[PDB]
């Protein structure tokens with residue numbers, strides 16, 4: 001995790017959102033790069049466990065109170081596939097992310113791996129880029145043999161720019 | 166500046182730097198004074214642009230439309246500075262005040278006296294001590310102070326309770 005994360009945040013420390021933190025695994029690895037760190041999760045127990053370890057982290061049930069055009073990186077570590085309200089999620093990601101921000105996807109490979117979650121709930125790159133349709137992949141990486149990783153960025157737009165700042 | 170908060174805030178906060186909430190922060194007047202005392206500072210206001218101006222000037226401040234995302238039993242001081250009397254959902258506000266405040270937390274009220282002082286908001290919308298304690302009825306006044314000659318000021322603590330303590334921690 002040290003193996004791959006620094007490559008991604010190496011250049012630019014900033015406002016990070018751990019979107020669907022559950023486990024709380026990735027938080028310690030994000031704190032080193034974070035001016036502010038938000039952890040968002042619908043599960044209240046999971047949020048308590050994080051507040052108990054890490055007092056500086058802003059815990060939220062939902063991204064509503066994250067200001068518009070304020071976020072540098074959003075991480076979905078194994079979290080998006082079973083998240084509720086995927087449309088609302090994508091819509092909030094677009095609102096909170098700066099024009100120059102990045103979305104980081106880490107999820108299980110769409111293969112029988114033996115461990116990890118049920119195969120029917122798993123998504124692959126092509127599935128992610130259906131939901132994240134205003135984005136394009138900028139890098140790929142391999143967190144473990146059973147996972148994949150994307151770093152995503154907004155499609156360059158020429159139309160109007162209605163994204164509020 | 167009619168209000169000179171350097172003259173009464175320190176006496177309140179001195180012993181006890183901590184988690185503070187400016188509830189109805191509006192103007193954002195009190196923020197610089199509260200920053201020198203807050204381990205965390207939350208600013209709450211329904212007015213979306215008022216919050217914007219607070220964000221533009223004070224980046225450590227956590228701005229919220231509402232106190233929902235503030236954790237249970239996590240707060241030391243809550244300030245209501247000229248803000249309760251016209252606040253929406255007063256019973257929802259008291260309820261949230263009770264949920265987020267610690268057992269030993271304090272509520273600070275500053276508001277306009279309920280007489281015609283010429284300056285200030287219309288006399289009809291104003292509340293005195295007695296009005297405040299109808300809303301903050303699980304609390305008692307611990308100290309009183311006079312921020313200005315047109316304002317009153319209270320420091321409030323929770324009533325001591327013999328019974329159950331259902332307040333989640």
Ligand SMILES: [Zn+2]
Pocket residue numbers: 048049052
């Ligand atoms: Zn715990």
Ligand SMILES: [Zn+2]
Pocket residue numbers: 084085
């Ligand atoms: Zn829904």
Ligand SMILES: [Zn+2]
Pocket residue numbers: 069098099161163164165
């Ligand atoms: Zn934009």
Ligand SMILES: [Zn+2]
Pocket residue numbers: 217218221
């Ligand atoms: Zn402004």
Ligand SMILES: [Zn+2]
Pocket residue numbers: 253254
């Ligand atoms: Zn209402």
Ligand SMILES: [Zn+2]
Pocket residue numbers: 238267268330332333334
């Ligand atoms: Zn309690």
